[PDB]
Design a protein around this nucleic acid. Structure first.
Ligand SMILES: [Li+]
Ligand SMILES: [Li+]
Length: 135
RNA sequence: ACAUCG
DNA sequence: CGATGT
């Protein structure tokens, strides 16, 4: 119904899918960029969306912040809830990096606690999520 | 179908 | 138009 302006919004961007993947997190209220991941040579949209949420969780926990996270990704929200990124991407030498980060993100989820609400950004009603790459 | 990525 | 996902 109502946007929770006191929140962190995350989103993936890519060049190709599979292709070059990056992600960022922004203050929903101001659009200030709070973190940005160095481009990863090969990954999928959903792997990047998953990493972005998990990085948001870690970012907020380190800062003792109870703010929620907005994501526009039905897939990644579920993967985080399950603590399991069910990606179809082949595991080979050229995808090793993204899969290492995904495996490490799952490992973090399985060794830490959080209460952060992970909320669906309602693009149809509210427009593009504030972290969108506008591509 | 729904949610995304280009 | 194509790919990633539930
Ligand atoms: Li997105
Ligand atoms: Li986006």
């Amino acid at each position: 119904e109502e946007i929770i302006w006191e929140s962190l919004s995350v989103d993936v961007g890519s060049q190709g899918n599979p292709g070059i993947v990056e992600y960022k997190g922004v203050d929903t209220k101001t659009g200030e960029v709070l973190f940005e991941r160095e481009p990863i040579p090969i990954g999928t949209n959903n792997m990047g969306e998953f990493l972005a949420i998990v990085h948001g969780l870690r970012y907020l926990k380190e800062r003792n912040s109870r703010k929620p996270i907005y994501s526009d990704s039905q897939t990644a929200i579920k993967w985080v809830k399950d603590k399991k990124a069910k990606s179809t991407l082949v595991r080979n030498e050229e995808t090793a990096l993204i899969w290492k980060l995904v495996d490490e993100a799952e490992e973090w989820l399985n060794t830490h606690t959080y209460e952060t609400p992970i909320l669906k950004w309602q693009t149809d009603k509210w427009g593009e999520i504030k972290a969108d790459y506008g591509r």
